Amino acid sequence: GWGYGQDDGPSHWHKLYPIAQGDRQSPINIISSQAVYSPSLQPLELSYEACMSLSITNNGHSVQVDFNDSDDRTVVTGGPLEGPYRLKQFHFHWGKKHDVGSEHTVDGKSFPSELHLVHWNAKKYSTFGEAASAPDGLAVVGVFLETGDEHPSMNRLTDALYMVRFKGTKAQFSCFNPKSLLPASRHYWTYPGSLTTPPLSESVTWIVLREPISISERQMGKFRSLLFTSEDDERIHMVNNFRPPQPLKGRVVKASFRA
Numbered sequence: 001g002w003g004y005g006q007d008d009g010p011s012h013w014h015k016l017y018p019i020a021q022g023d024r025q026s027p028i029n030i031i032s033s034q035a036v037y038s039p040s041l042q043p044l045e046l047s048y049e050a051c052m053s054l055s056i057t058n059n060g061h062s063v064q065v066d067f068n069d070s071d072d073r074t075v076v077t078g079g080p081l082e083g084p085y086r087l088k089q090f091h092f093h094w095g096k097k098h099d100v101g102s103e104h105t106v107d108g109k110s111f112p113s114e115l116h117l118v119h120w121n122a123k124k125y126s127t128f129g130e131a132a133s134a135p136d137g138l139a140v141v142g143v144f145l146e147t148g149d150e151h152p153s154m155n156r157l158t159d160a161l162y163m164v165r166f167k168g169t170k171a172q173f174s175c176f177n178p179k180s181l182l183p184a185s186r187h188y189w190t191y192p193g194s195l196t197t198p199p200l201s202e203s204v205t206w207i208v209l210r211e212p213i214s215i216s217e218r219q220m221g222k223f224r225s226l227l228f229t230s231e232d233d234e235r236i237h238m239v240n241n242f243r244p245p246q247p248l249k250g251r252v253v254k255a256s257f258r259a
């Protein structure tokens, strides 16, 4: 019952999921001058294996790559996290135009796209769903994307989009290392938040990396070729599939660096 259209978009989600107006909603506008430098935070480590990816799917809301999370081969640790969180999947948010698309913004600025690497506390909870209902259940690493030089590793992903252009379609996607989609810097902003799609559960520890990665305009354009609709229905391009900034509500945003 929810989407990114004019009748079912983010401004209307609260009608179905009241938590949409909660105190720990995401995304947010990150005001760099207001982030608190927290040196007490441990080093952020993204230990990813080369072949943990299972497939790529167009679920009607984004294009998602799912991982095998039976062990701790691909996990995030350090920074604000007390222990390791296993990678479940990653997906993206992008716009119809080149000046919008990201969910988080920095000092009012949006990027063309935003990548979310979704991890869960498999050590404490039995299922991803169970962890998604607990404050300390999930850890999402956000990476901003801008257009510039072509991204070599991104080609494998963008070349696979055609086969999953229609909603509900999926394809096998083996040996794709999400580490290849990370910037050289490990600086980040962290704050307690929520899923940015219904049920919008406030179970996410957000880790937004400071440095964006760049992909070519051609690559960005492939994402816009995806569709919100299925093969039969009329064609509606999957664009502007992002939730805009939500009220900070007195939350504290920490930074691993000094602006």
Ligand SMILES: [Zn+2]
Residues within 6 Å of the ligand: 091, 092, 093, 116, 196
């Ligand atoms: Zn997301």
